[PDB]
């Protein structure tokens, strides 16, 4: 139950940090 | 106590490595 929360949050912050890196580039 | 240290340092190194990746890009 908490595992999928961790997974979804991880995917989310992944897309966000990748987006930040790309945009800053 | 150590939790916020790990968190802050994590955010720090995260933005720094993302910035490095972006600049090199």
From Swiss-Prot, chains A, B:
Q: Where in the cell is it found?
A: Cell membrane; Postsynaptic cell membrane; Postsynaptic density membrane
Describe the PTM.
Palmitoylated. Depalmitoylated upon L-glutamate stimulation. Ubiquitinated by RNF167, leading to its degradation.
Annotated membrane-spanning segments are 1-20
Expression sites (tissue/organ)? Detected in forebrain. Detected in dendrites of neuronal cells. Expressed in the pyramidal cell layers of CA1 and CA3 and in the granule cell layer of the dentate gyrus.
What induces this protein's gene, according to its Swiss-Prot or TrEMBL record? Down-regulated in the pyramidal cell layer of CA1 in the hippocampus by global ischemia.
Q: What is known of its domains?
A: The M4 transmembrane segment mediates tetramerization and is required for cell surface expression.
The subunit field of the Swiss-Prot or TrEMBL record says:
Homotetramer or heterotetramer of pore-forming glutamate receptor subunits. Tetramers may be formed by the dimerization of dimers. May interact with MPP4. Forms a ternary complex with GRIP1 and CSPG4. Interacts with ATAD1 in an ATP-dependent manner. ATAD1-catalyzed ATP hydrolysis disrupts binding to ATAD1 and to GRIP1 and leads to AMPAR complex disassembly. Interacts with GRIP2. Interacts with GRIP1. Interacts with NSF via its C-terminus. Interacts with CACNG2, PICK1 and GRIP2. Interacts with GRIA1 and SYNDIG1. Part of a complex containing GRIA2, NSF and NAPA and/or NAPB.
Further remark: The postsynaptic actions of L-glutamate are mediated by a variety of receptors that are named according to their selective agonists. This receptor binds AMPA (quisqualate) > L-glutamate > kainate.
Q: What does this protein do?
A: Ionotropic glutamate receptor that functions as a ligand-gated cation channel, gated by L-glutamate and glutamatergic agonists such as alpha-amino-3-hydroxy-5-methyl-4-isoxazolepropionic acid (AMPA), quisqualic acid, and kainic acid. L-glutamate acts as an excitatory neurotransmitter at many synapses in the central nervous system and plays an important role in fast excitatory synaptic transmission.
- Which protein family is it in? Belongs to the glutamate-gated ion channel (TC 1.A.10.1) family. GRIA2 subfamily.
Q: What is this protein called?
A: Glutamate receptor 2
Query: Where does this protein come from, organism-wise?
Result: Rattus norvegicus
List the range of the whole protein covered here. 618 to 642 of 883
């Amino acid at each position: 139950s908490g595992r999928i929360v961790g997974g979804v949050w991880w995917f989310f912050t992944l897309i966000i940090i990748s987006s930040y890196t790309a945009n800053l580039a």
